[PDB]
């Protein structure tokens, strides 16, 4: 298949309605990604972008081992301008977790001539487009498009084409658009497939005002904004929930997770409204103190380890506990314990609730009541 091949149009698509389960609490619960979406993973150097994309890639082996080609999300990872040793570490990571059997890694590394860095994302999109067009689902990670833009800048300036902003050529938007827009979800007339794009961008100093950032932020359906100030506070992944936004939104969230994520989002919005006084939490009003406490505990509740995606059945009870206010009694430092212990209890007890949050995917009132029961019981034991 050709590298530059026209993206599908309006008619053949169908609306994004099914989830790309990343297993990262901070994403599935606040900035969800659906099969067909385009989500910008934008952040400064070493702020965790590849880690988000790779946790997403790794999680899928819960579904990709089974029987239904509908749940399986095959992955393509385009490494542009990276060093070959980093790709070797990446394939070693994917091999440790067995995720290579359903991942394709396309490498135009820094030493590869500039034309191949400019072209590699297009050919990886053509690879994923096969899965898209043949009734399967795919996920393509561009790591990263800033370096593709630099390669295209080298190409253009050495072709004596005129520069525009930031010395980038006048048609880099057309480049990234005719690249990304090929990510789509198709309709039953065309095979029900999808291809989801997780483009990375390397913002210098967090400046979303640069040219390539300004373009990609507008091309994509949303952005996961990784920040260093959050990273160093142990909020990892360092997702600035405020700056992060998804236009598909609830249509992508798992039902059970949408139910609780609405309230999670509302409480964190209140927390962001109050945050300017977070360091003065003592003397503040009763309601402001309640919102500071709960916002801090929720922000902590989202942090999770590298290479460890939680399934939705483990996210839902946990976000429920955070929202409904059970964790308000737990010291901020012990929350990391609460999760690792609490989930174990839900397997030692109330296993039906997890099993059905997975099977049904929906928190029926019965399941919500039993979940409240289990949460009360463990916060009593805790």
């Amino acid at each position: 298949s050709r590298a530059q091949v026209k993206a599908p149009g309006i008619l053949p698509r169908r609306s994004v309605h099914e989830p790309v389960q990343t297993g990262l609490k901070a994403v599935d619960a606040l900035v969800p990604i659906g099969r067909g979406q385009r989500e910008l993973i934008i952040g400064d150097r070493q702020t965790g972008k590849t880690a988000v994309a790779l946790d997403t890639i790794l999680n899928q082996k819960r579904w990709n081992n089974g029987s239904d080609e509908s749940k399986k999300l095959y992955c393509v990872y385009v490494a542009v301008g990276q060093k070959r040793s980093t790709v070797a570490q990446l394939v070693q990571t994917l091999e440790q977790h067995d995720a290579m059997k359903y991942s394709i890694i396309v490498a135009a590394t820094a030493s590869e001539a500039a034309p191949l860095q400019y072209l590699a994302p297009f050919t990886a999109a053509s690879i994923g487009e096969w899965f898209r067009d043949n009734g399967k689902h795919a996920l393509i990670v561009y790591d990263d498009l800033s370096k593709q833009a630099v390669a295209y800048r080298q190409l253009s300036l050495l072709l004596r084409r005129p520069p525009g902003r930031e010395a980038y050529p006048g048609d880099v938007f057309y480049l990234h658009s005719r690249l990304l827009e090929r990510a789509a979800k198709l309709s039953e007339k065309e095979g029900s497939g999808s291809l989801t794009a997780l483009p990375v961008i390397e913002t210098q100093g967090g400046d979303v005002s640069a040219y390539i950032p300004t373009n990609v932020i507008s091309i994509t359906d949303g952005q996961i904004f990784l920040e260093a100030e959050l990273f160093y506070k142990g909020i990892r992944p360092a997702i600035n929930v405020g700056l992060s936004v998804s236009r598909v939104g609830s249509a992508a969230q798992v039902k059970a997770l949408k139910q609780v994520a609405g309230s999670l989002k509302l409480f964190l919005a209140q927390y962001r409204e109050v945050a300017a006084f977070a360091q003065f939490g003592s003397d503040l009003d009763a309601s402001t103190k309640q919102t500071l406490v709960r916002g801090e505990r929720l922000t902590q509740l989202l942090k999770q380890n590298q290479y460890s995606p939680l399934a939705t059945e483990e996210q839902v009870p946990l976000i429920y506990a955070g929202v409904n206010g059970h964790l308000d009694g737990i010291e901020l430092s012990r929350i990391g314990e609460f999760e690792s212990s609490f989930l174990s209890y839900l397997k030692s007890n109330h296993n039906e609730l997890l099993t059905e949050i997975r099977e049904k995917g929906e928190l029926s009132k019965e399941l919500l009541a039993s979940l409240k029961s289990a949460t009360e019981s463990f916060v009593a034991t805790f």
């Binding site: 005129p162 520069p163 930031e166 967090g206 400046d207 003397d283």
Partner: protein, 232 residues
């Protein structure tokens, strides 16, 4: 990094400076009443203590609100150095982290305004009807003495049918005096603290103004450089 960011940073620091400057003036306005409530109570105290000159629990008095600088910190330092009943949320907070089992009684809400004999008397009345301060050898009052418009010192004054009624009374009178001197010290400390804060804000504004100018020059140079590369 970019011009808009330095501009919003500078605008926030300017708003902080404005707020602290307004707070200084408000504190200076309240100081006028705090001074007189202190003067009257100082005369009343000297009059009552003339009797102790001729003839002969720890109540820690502070405010409920912060931004007083070192007021609460210095009074808690004095308490621990000497070492309980707390008046004010802040001293209560300072002590609750160190001796939770020692706080017997906490009073809140009196820190917002000058003390009145009603407040002192009812606080003493809770000490006598709840804490049962009766016949305790251990009774003293720790409070701030306002030394100047720019300084305050943590201080202690001891506490001691009329021979009993006089203790039951000087409890309220000395508590009033301590709350009044603590209110004057708190107001003065806040005036000084907000003035210092506004001066520091002006200094930070100067620094970020240097940075705004430098970023303006750099922005223009970069933009015109790119344009000139284009015009080749």
């Amino acid at each position: 990094a970019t011009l808009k960011e330095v501009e919003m940073r500078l605008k926030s620091i300017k708003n902080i400076e404005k707020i602290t400057k307004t707070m200084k003036i408000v504190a200076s306005t309240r100081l006028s009443k705090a001074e007189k409530a202190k003067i009257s109570a100082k005369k009343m105290d000297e009059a009552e203590q003339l009797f102790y000159k001729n003839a002969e629990l720890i109540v820690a008095i502070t405010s409920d609100k912060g931004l007083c600088g070192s007021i609460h910190s210095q009074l808690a330092k004095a308490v621990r150095r000497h070492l309980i009943v707390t008046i004010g949320d802040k001293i209560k907070m300072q002590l609750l982290r160190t001796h939770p089992n020692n706080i017997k009684l906490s009073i809140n809400g009196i820190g917002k305004d000058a003390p009145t004999f009603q407040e002192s008397a009812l606080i003493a009345d809770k000490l006598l009807s709840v804490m049962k301060a009766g016949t305790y050898p251990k009774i003293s009052i720790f409070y701030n003495d306002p030394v100047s418009s720019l300084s305050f010192e943590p201080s202690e004054k001891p506490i001691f049918n009329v021979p009993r009624d006089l203790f039951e009374y000087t409890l309220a009178n000395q508590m009033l005096t301590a709350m009044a001197q603590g209110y004057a010290a708190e107001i003065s400390a806040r005036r000084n603290a907000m003035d210092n804060a506004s001066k520091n804000a002006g200094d930070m504004i100067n620094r970020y103004s240097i940075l705004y100018n430098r970023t303006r020059q750099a922005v223009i140079t970069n933009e015109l450089v790119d344009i000139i590369t284009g015009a080749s």
